[PDB]
């Protein structure tokens, strides 16, 4: 089952 995207964090 494809994960899909997530919301980008403030820190990388």
């Amino acid at each position, epitope marked *: 089952p494809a994960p899909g995207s*997530t919301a980008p964090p*403030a820190h990388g």
Partner: antibody, heavy 116, light 109 residues
């Protein structure tokens, strides 16, 4: 549209414990990093911590990792902040926040007063 | 460890104002992922910038992020009276953010 509803604001005595909740709706909670901060008069804004969607990374500011614990339940769209052994200087308005590039979404705040 | 900002700045509507953000450990670099958060009355917090340059969706274009010398910076072009507020900076140190003391920005009303 997006609501971060916080719950559990009140009075606790020095050395007590307390758990705050923040229920998220309007976004896919399971896909957002979440964070806890606090605001007190004269103490500005202080970053407590953050937690990834899968909870496998829980980052804390070293000064507060000892007696603060961040958790989440994705099935119930809920973020939790637990505090132990609290002291007078822990009095503050605590805020849950959701990351999207920056501190994108914010809760309404939860007042915690530590007084004997 | 400690993040320092100007305590207060005053500008006029339509003018340009730049707030800075210093790290006590060294020069502020992209890996500090400077964040900028705005506090308006009634503890209304609005995320402005993340990772130095990226605007939070919905933030107007007049809020810009950059690095100036050894510091991070937020620039408001054509400041509006509604921008009168406190501006907190946050720098990332490997595994935790540290907020600065905040800058009270006055946009003369």
């Amino acid at each position: 549209e997006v609501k971060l509803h916080q719950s559990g604001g009140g009075l606790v005595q020095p050395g007590g414990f307390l758990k705050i909740s923040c229920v998220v709706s309007g976004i896919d909670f399971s896909r957002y990093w979440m964070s806890w901060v606090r605001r007190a008069p004269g103490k500005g804004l202080e970053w407590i911590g953050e937690i990834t969607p899968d909870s496998n990374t829980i980052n804390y500011v070293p000064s507060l990792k000892d007696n603060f614990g961040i958790s989440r339940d994705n099935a119930k769209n809920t973020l939790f902040l637990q505090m132990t052994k609290v002291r007078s200087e822990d009095t503050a308005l605590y805020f849950c926040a959701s990351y999207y590039e920056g501190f994108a979404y914010w809760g309404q705040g939860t007042l915690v007063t530590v007084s004997a | 460890a400690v993040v320092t900002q100007e305590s207060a700045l005053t500008t006029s509507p339509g003018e340009t104002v730049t707030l800075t953000c210093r790290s006590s450990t060294g020069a502020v670099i992209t890996s500090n992922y400077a964040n900028w958060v705005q506090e308006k009355p009634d503890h209304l917090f609005t995320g402005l910038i993340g990772r130095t340059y990226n605007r939070v969706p919905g933030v107007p274009a007049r809020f810009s992020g950059s690095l100036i010398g050894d510091k991070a910076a937020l620039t408001i072009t054509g400041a509006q009276t509604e921008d009168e507020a406190i501006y907190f900076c946050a720098l990332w140190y490997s595994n935790h953010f540290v907020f600065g003391g905040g800058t009270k920005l006055t946009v003369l009303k």
